[PDB]
Structure 1
């Protein structure tokens, strides 16, 4: 015997990785944080521009998820709308923790704190980012956790939850096996990853409150954001 994924699991992981790694110009966000104007308007513009590009990326990643096309079309839209917020926060946590130039963390925080976001929501946002950082996550972990977040059968209303469970279970199984292969000295690693998914769910309520605040302060969103975030 051995500790390896079976050939079908290696294949499934390969297409999740090929899809996840499809990132046009990853230096762009890094340079925007470092070089753009430091105004409340520019900071908000980075967020809507990055969040819009991310939704496009998320739909392309989602539609290629193993078995996603076997799903009822209303449940497909509900999974995408129900997971968009968590996926954005998980993706932000990934970029936050990447090897970035000196001062990037300080400049990014200076921007987040000048984006019309209340202090009440910045605290759990930074706490989550730091907890993600402590786990020292691989690209495989970020890609699989994102797929698991999208294919969640227990968050929002879904007509056929069993159909969604059946697509999520092999992803959870590939992820647990990768923790046994890549972190064998830490048997509680998988449970820590699942702990982070529990923490991710708190951002649904946080984001709903941030959106209400932005709308009150006459903030504009792109048609694609208005649709996925259900803005009126």
Structure 2
């Protein structure tokens, strides 16, 4: 209704202005778990208000808005972390005061496995030299796409427009037609890996549930219950 009526630069500045802030945090197993889950809960609140600014997201009904966020919240959370940790190789920047190691991931059962996947993604972003304008596009794509199948013509229109926006950035960067196709493909293939980390992260999160280690906030348990 309104999102389709933007230029790509209007689309980019819309996304860049809506960017959530970088939060801070306040090691044993339960201690590091308390930190990360508390951080995730606070980041979740910002994401929701960020989601309400992604062009065309408001045009969807409240139920569909809920579904998409229920499906992609851990993905969006992860691609943000991967983006922060971009210029801290071998490390994950959960917060400016919380920079973690692959070795520190061994403080929690099965955490190190997901750490390496996150580290590998951050390394990949560094290798591709991902731009901030490209980052906010992918993050928006995940929001609109990750839950669009488990239900639409409008969401695809918005999705197609972000694709146009992505290409505009690359063509602006002086890339040949071929380089644009390949880079576009390279980017969207990452989202397949990010989905994989989300699902692996989802069940690991669920294993700390039931088998209680640290209590989880009600908002966090709600998002976690959407995935069975």
What is the aligned length?
214
Deviation at 1:215, TM superposition (A): 1.5
What are the superposed Cα offsets for residues 95-128 of structure 1, whole Å, 9 maximum, x if unpaired?
111359x997984333332133344433333322
Deviation at 1:191, TM superposition (A): 1.4
The residue number in structure 2 matching 1:3 is none
Greater Cα shift, 60-69 or 197-206 = 197-206
In the alignment, the residues of structure 2 paired with residue 7 and residue 68 of structure 1 have an alpha-carbon distance, to the nearest angstrom, of: 14
Q: Is there any run of 5+ residues in structure 2 with no aligned partner, and where? A: none
5 Å-filtered alignment, 1:73-84, equals 73-84=62-73
Q: Is there any run of 5+ residues in structure 1 with no aligned partner, and where? A: 1-5
5 Å-filtered alignment, 1:69-148, equals 69-98=58-87, 107-148=100-141
The residue number in structure 1 matching 2:184 is 190
The residue number in structure 1 matching 2:216 is 221
RMSD: 2.9
In the alignment, the residues of structure 1 paired with residue 224 and residue 18 of structure 2 have an alpha-carbon distance, to the nearest angstrom, of: 23
TM-score (norm 2): 0.81
In the alignment, the residues of structure 1 paired with residue 70 and residue 174 of structure 2 have an alpha-carbon distance, to the nearest angstrom, of: 33
Q: Which among 161, 171, 175 is matched to residue 162 of structure 2? A: 171
In the alignment, the residues of structure 2 paired with residue 120 and residue 12 of structure 1 have an alpha-carbon distance, to the nearest angstrom, of: 36
